[PDB]
Structure 1
């Protein structure tokens, strides 16, 4: 998994249920990084079109999330009202292969 990345960010509105429409997490094994595991249809994240499964989530509203659990990051995002800025690394690989990869067994994730 030697894949180059580029930093980016997107500001997404919360939907009526306080969702942006992504799952964040990764494998069961230790990883110091956190990944978008799923983008759900018809949610702010999907309609915006910027983020995708396999992208690394790196921060929230100008704060790095490094060293935090996926539950802590989710809690952080859930507590931001109306509008949230998601910081990410785009992985420079076949997007469909990234989707499949993070579709795999043993992937743990929190929907927000």
Structure 2
């Protein structure tokens, strides 16, 4: 595994970093997809299944999925995503 950490991604011309965020099942949030030809893909660090733990230095504990999405979208220019790298099992 890669080590947990953070990456500062430059927003593209569609104001996207190139991830979709999911989770929030009946509190943790996760990357669902990394989109081709986007900053997140170009950088290669983040991956589907990674837990998102923070945005721009701030914890997202107690925030809803949509709150975090709105936060990331609102940021101009570049945004820092803090992530954890979790074990997965292939079955």
TM-score (norm 1): 0.72
Root-mean-square deviation over aligned CA pairs: 4.3
2: distance between equivalents of 1:24 and 1:9? 16
Taking the TM superposition and a 5 Å limit, the aligned residue runs for 1:66-77 are: 66-77=61-72
Q: Runs (4+) of structure 1 moved beyond 3 Å?
A: none
Distance change in 2, residues 1:27/1:79 (3 Å): closer
C-alpha spacing 1:59/1:27, structure 2 compared with 1 (3 Å): closer
CA contact (8 A) 2:11 2:78 kept: yes
Partner-residue secondary structure (3-state), 2:85: strand
d(CA) in 2 for partners of 1:74 and 1:28? Answer: 15
Distance change >3 Å, CA 76–CA 27, structure 1 → 2: closer
Displacement of 1:13: 0.2
Unaligned runs of 5+ in 1: 1-5, 93-110
Distance 1:59 1:27 in 2: 15
Q: How many residues align?
A: 87
Superposition TM-score, scaled by structure 2 size: 0.87
Distance (Å, rounded) in 1 between the aligned partners of 2:52 and 2:19: 11
Cα deviations by residue, 1:27-77 (Å, 9 ceiling, x for unpaired): 643xx2110011110100001000000000010011001111111001111
